[PDB]
Design a protein around this ligand. Structure first.
Ligand SMILES: CCC(=O)N(CCCCCCNC(=N)N)C1CCN(CCc2ccccc2)CC1
Lengths: 53, 283, 217, 336
């Protein structure tokens, strides 16, 4: 019976958050993911001189 | 020459199957299984010592045809020695596999110490060492001698012949026929008695199909060894005790009997490997 | 090329040797997993032999070393950690035989036994069913018929037939009778033969394992 | 009381609120990106010392040393470049299901089926390693543990709770209690100010270390989940479940963003990790092999098949040069 008081207090706090439209939150994943593509050795194969393994 | 057709053919058949089966076995045993457990070590060494003893055969094939030893003193000593060597180190692996299996069934609690994959490595090495007690003395005493017809490989023993030529023949008899037949029989003998009283292997119609399969596999192993090894030993001893005038049939019988000896090395992959439960359980 | 790295490689070889030695030493102990319903007899069992999440119990008998883990104090999704224990030599399942009337309880214990026996991880592991409190079963069967717990049962309300019927009820819950064996025993207070029974079952299991390893199935 | 039905109002108010902010179809924003192509990686190492299944793994910040715990009772520290061993710690409880390895490089941690997280000291006088402390106080069993400093460690146990310890004191500073099932994994944000956890409720939550209150809850899985990992930007994470279905959530938009699945996969997932740039998502299955998903178009990009039993741990170095996978095979492979 106490959990009901606790649980409702939780859902109240979680329901008031400033969301943002997903297209805005999806471009940022796109921009970061390509502003680092150069220095990702798994994606672009590395010349054998600089490959420690 | 009908005889020359058969004698050349019989050895060729043995040699080709022996190299084919054995070299396949070493390939599979190391490519996939990679020698994890004690038994897989043993099968490899049997496969190895079978391959070597089979590769000596073709040099014996050409010797029959020409009646002359063309390969010179350089190769004669390295051929005969590797033939006597592989007889003992192939047999002793068979005796070690049997003594191992008997421990693992009739003394289950003490086998927790003897049977470790490190100890399997010691025994195999110690097995090749003890075989050299006959591999090396034949290396030094091997010689090439010119005869009335041509050169033939032969072992010139020592100053006395009546007292030392027979010693090798009698010694190889006891330590390569009597001891092997004895211990692979008793050790496999007592295994089957104990397997009767195992609660896992009795009580159902399907259970006894497993007990039937095991006692067939064990019995086959002893049967092949007896049949493929007895004739040559008895034929050697008899030829050492009486004249046996050289009839065309005597030449036919002798070479065939020798080929029967090498049949043991060809059948070993089918029995010890191609019938192993794990070998089927990976293909 | 390898100036003082040789010292590093030597250190590697030494600790590799120590690892191998410890593994060989620990591969000659026999591990037993002790399930059982809620305090059915599990506390009693560990007394007869020589003698926080789980608690081990190392003991020896006839030059054999047993470790025996019980997991009664581990309250969580059994599915999420039961797979740690595959490869134990045997399961010891402990059942109280005087619980057929108190609360039904036998039905729950049979449900647990069925769940454990046919798990995807214990498809081959042998189990030893121990049946405790046979003494109280004497003067509990006298008044309360076993039909209370087994309505489809027709037989004499005596100890001899009831015990055999219960053992038969438990012993046919394994759906794979051609691969795993179930050992059964009615516990006895004195006459320390319980450990003897465990010894016999474990020796048969070792025999089967060796036969598998040698390549004879 | 009427509360039990009033909570249903809020649970329905939220769903519509986050529905009003969904015009993306991220699969539609990202149709003009050239694909990654094909990824072929080859094992460059194989570390072979363990004698039983291995359950965890963790790289050092050096991206050279790694620690790996198996259930034979040994957690050893390898050396990726020259495949040596620099320590072999024998530990008291043979049942272990986790590892950590401090950012500084001084300590390791290791817990298991005995409810106790042990912190070992490596750089010490007298040579060998010694047990610096044994943290106790959980009731379920340790399932994951991570380091923040050389002084604070955060753990997640099987009794539906997480906690934040203090090492010298040896006591629970804070406790996060919101789940309703077991807690299976854990992941810290890059700035170590808030972490996420994934439970057997098919739900993940987002706490924060300073205060001690969960801020958001993400649902959408059909079954239990076993792995978590932050997107390196600190604004998204991906989870792995027993549906054979990874999926990517977003912290700011506050909902599911894409799902990864394929029809000829019915298996379970045991570990997840992102590459350094975040472009391609690793994931380890019980199929005995781990896939490589392109994290922006959801199509496969290759496989890594080298094990003979299910893979149970996976990790990517800090400088993004290698991946290391371990498995119940008892061996560890370093792909590249
Ligand atoms: C008691 C038996 C005996 O005396 N043998 C061996 C008979 C062949 C059996 C070998 C099976 N091995 C296996 N691994 N299965 C001897 C028979 C004679 N050979 C002569 C060699 C040779 C002969 C001429 C030129 C070069 C070499 C020496 C061995």
């Amino acid at each position: 019976i106490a959990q009901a008081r606790k649980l409702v207090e939780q859902l109240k706090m979680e329901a008031n958050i400033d969301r943002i439209k997903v297209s805005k939150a999806a471009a940022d994943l796109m921009a970061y993911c390509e502003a680092h593509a150069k220095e990702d050795p798994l994606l672009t194969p590395v010349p054998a001189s600089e490959n420690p393994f | 020459m009908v005889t020359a057709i058969t004698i050349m053919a019989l050895y060729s058949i043995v040699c080709v199957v022996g190299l084919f089966g054995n070299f396949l076995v070493m390939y599979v045993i190391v490519r996939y299984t990679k020698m994890k457990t004690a038994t897989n070590i043993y099968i490899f060494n049997l496969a190895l010592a079978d391959a070597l003893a089979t590769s000596t055969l073709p040099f014996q094939s050409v010797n029959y045809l020409m009646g002359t030893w063309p390969f010179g003193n350089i190769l004669c000593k390295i051929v005969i020695s590797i033939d006597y060597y592989n007889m003992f180190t192939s047999i002793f692996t068979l005796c070690t596999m049997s003594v191992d299996r008997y421990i693992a069934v009739c003394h289950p609690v003490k086998a927790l110490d003897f049977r470790t994959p490190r100890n399997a490595k010691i025994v195999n090495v110690c097995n090749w060492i003890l075989s050299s007690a006959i591999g090396l003395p034949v290396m030094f005493m091997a010689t090439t001698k010119y005869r009335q017809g041509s050169i033939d490989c032969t072992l010139t023993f020592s100053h006395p012949t009546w007292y030392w030529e027979n010693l090798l023949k009698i010694c190889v008899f006891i330590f390569a026929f009597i001891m092997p037949v004895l211990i692979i029989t008793v050790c496999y003998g007592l295994m089957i008695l104990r397997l009767k009283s195992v609660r896992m292997l009795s009580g159902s119609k399907e259970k006894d199909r497993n007990l039937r399969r095991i006692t067939r596999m064990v019995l086959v192993v002893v049967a092949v060894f007896i049949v493929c090894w007895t004739p040559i030993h008895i034929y050697v001893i008899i030829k050492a005790l009486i004249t046996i005038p050289e009839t065309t049939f005597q030449t036919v019988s002798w070479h065939f009997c020798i080929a029967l000896g090498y049949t043991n090395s060809c059948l070993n992959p089918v029995l010890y490997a191609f019938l192993d439960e794990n070998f089927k359980r990976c293909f | 090329l390898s100036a003082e790295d040789k010292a590093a490689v030597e250190r590697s070889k030494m600790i590799d040797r120590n690892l191998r030695e410890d593994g060989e030493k620990a591969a000659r102990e026999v591990k037993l997993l002790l399930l059982g319903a809620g305090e059915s007899g599990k506390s009693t069992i560990v007394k007869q032999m020589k003698i926080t999440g789980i608690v081990e119990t190392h003991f020896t008998f006839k030059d054999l070393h047993f470790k025996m883990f019980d997991v009664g104090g581990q309250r969580s999704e059994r599915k999420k950690w039961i797979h740690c224990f595959e490869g134990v030599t045997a399961i010891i399942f402990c059942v109280a035989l005087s619980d057929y009337d108190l609360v039904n309880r036998m039905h729950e214990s049979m449900k647990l036994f069925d769940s454990i026996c046919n798990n995807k991880w214990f498809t081959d592991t042998s189990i030893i069913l121990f049946l405790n409190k046979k003494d109280l079963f004497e003067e509990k069967i006298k008044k309360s018929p076993l039909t209370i717990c087994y309505p489809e049962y027709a037989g004499s309300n005596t100890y001899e037939e009831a015990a055999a019927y219960i053992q038969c009820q438990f012993e046919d819950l394994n759906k794979r009778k051609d691969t795993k064996e179930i050992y059964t025993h009615f516990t006895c207070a004195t006459d320390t033969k319980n450990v003897q029974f465990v010894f016999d079952a474990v020796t048969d299991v070792i025999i089967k394992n060796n036969l598998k390893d040698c390549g004879l199935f | 009381d009427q509360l039990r039905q009033e909570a249903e109002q809020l649970k329905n108010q939220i769903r519509d609120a986050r529905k009003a902010c969904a015009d993306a179809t991220l699969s539609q924003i990202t149709n003009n990106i050239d694909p990654v192509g094909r990824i072929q990686m080859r094992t460059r190492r194989t570390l072979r010392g363990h004698l039983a299944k291995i359950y965890a793994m963790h790289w050092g910040t050096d991206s050279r040393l790694l620690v790996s715990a198996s259930q034979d009772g040994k957690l050893i520290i390898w050396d990726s470049y020259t495949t040596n061993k620099v320590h072999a710690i024998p530990l008291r409880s043979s049942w272990v299901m986790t590892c950590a390895y401090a950012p500084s490089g001084n300590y390791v941690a290791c817990g298991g089926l005995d409810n106790i997280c042990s912190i070992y000291n490596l750089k010490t006088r007298e040579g060998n390693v010694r047990v610096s402390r044994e943290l106790a106080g959980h009731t379920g069993y340790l399932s994951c543990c991570r380091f923040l400093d050389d002084n604070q460690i955060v753990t997640s146990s099987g009794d539906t709770t997480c906690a934040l310890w203090d090492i010298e004191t040896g006591q629970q500073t804070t406790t996060f209690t919101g789940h309703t099932g077991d807690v299976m994994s854990l992941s810290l944000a890059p700035d170590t100010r808030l972490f996420v956890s994934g439970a057997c409720d098919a739900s993940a939550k987002l706490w924060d270390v300073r205060e001690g209150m969960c801020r958001q809850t993400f649902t959408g899985h059909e079954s239990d989940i076993n792995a978590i990992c932050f997107f390196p930007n600190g604004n998204a994470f991906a989870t792995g479940s027993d549906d054979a279905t990874c999926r990517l959530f977003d912290l700011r938009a506050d909902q599911e963003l894409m799902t990864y699945s394929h029809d000829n996969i019915i298996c379970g997932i045991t570990s997840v990790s992102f590459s350094k740039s975040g472009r391609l998502l690793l994931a380890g299955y019980d199929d005995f092999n781990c896939n490589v998903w392109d994290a922006l178009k959801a199509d496969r990009a290759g496989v890594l098949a080298g094990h003979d039993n299910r893979v149970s741990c996976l990790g990517v170095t800090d400088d993004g040069m290698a991946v290391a996978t371990g498995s119940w095979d008892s061996f560890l492979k370093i792909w590249n």
